[PDB]
Design a protein around this ligand. Structure first.
Ligand code: NA
Ligand code: NA
Lengths: 183, 198
């Protein structure tokens, strides 16, 4: 009512109980995050990117990903040991709409995993977003269960939304509204 | 809770879908001409200048004058993922409305038919139906796998049009946008390549 916009993603650490989320510095954190997933290429199964040939390739993907205005990534730490990353996508202030995505958690992280997500959930609603989305490949059982567990409501399935590694992807779309966050 | 999809085979001969045509798309009663924002602009403006209710469920309009409308058109078509076309009777230059693609994602073969702006004389006529059919045909011939149609949930006529055209309802994105100082929930509809075949 005189709605203008939701707030900007944090440019300083988001401090939790078990976890700190550090704004991602692609060329700095990049090598650390690359090493987290090297060796286990099955990590890139339910995702549209990866694996990466080498650190250069990973840093390239990270730079180009974070260069988008609508995307902001954070590094998960306990210490400054990077344990995974995640962030916001389709971040549109004017509509108070945002998505929590790019969840890339090391086997060691996958209660700290849960807190990383909630910190961004909490932060998006405190910055006055109206809608937070969560999306996943329909083959991804764990992600879908995670969404329900956090309180996201299933809205529908975007059929044939993507081709991921030459296979079909249907995207499940879930959302929490600001009235839902309150309740 | 929503389906768990099983493993499926690889898609044979998958490649990125093509770019939007840069030449006219010719049908039997209609042709879709690539929009030339500053040339076609004043004609299209006049078409809607009269009844501001046209814009009621859309995220733009009305336009205070021609220049505002040309400015909007130009900035909309400047986006690399949007292409618009002017609806003309076959082999005529008389603009009867416009429409096009947005959110083109060539790498995933996903596209959205939108910016459907039909004059009253065009609405609910055989040329309107052909205009939309020509963008579907064209998208699937270009290798798109999924064609969306989206509307404000309060836009009854657009939802019924989508269904009439054979898009399937997928769901509603609640509080997706703030449009003209009110909430918008968005209905999402789609037509898949295999549905188009049938
Ligand atoms: Na960014
Ligand atoms: Na364009």
């Amino acid at each position: 009512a005189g709605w203008r916009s939701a707030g900007k993603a944090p440019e300083a650490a988001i401090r939790g109980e078990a976890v700190s989320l550090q704004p991602l510095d692609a060329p700095r954190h990049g090598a650390a995050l690359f090493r987290l997933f090297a060796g286990d290429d099955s990590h890139w199964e339910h995702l549209p990117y990866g694996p990466f040939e080498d650190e250069d390739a990973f840093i390239t993907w990270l730079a180009l990903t974070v260069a988008q205005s609508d995307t902001a990534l954070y590094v998960v730490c306990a210490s400054d040991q990077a344990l995974g990353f995640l962030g916001y996508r389709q971040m549109v202030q004017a509509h108070g709409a945002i998505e929590i995505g790019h969840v890339n958690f090391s086997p060691a992280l996958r209660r700290l995993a849960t807190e990383a997500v909630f910190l961004l959930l909490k932060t998006a609603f405190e910055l006055g977003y109206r809608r937070c989305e969560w999306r996943c490949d329909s083959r991804n059982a764990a992600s879908a269960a995670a969404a329900r567990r956090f309180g996201f409501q299933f809205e529908g399935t975007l059929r044939q939304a993507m081709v991921v590694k030459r296979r079909n992807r249907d995207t499940h779309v879930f959302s929490m509204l600001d009235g839902e966050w309150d309740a």
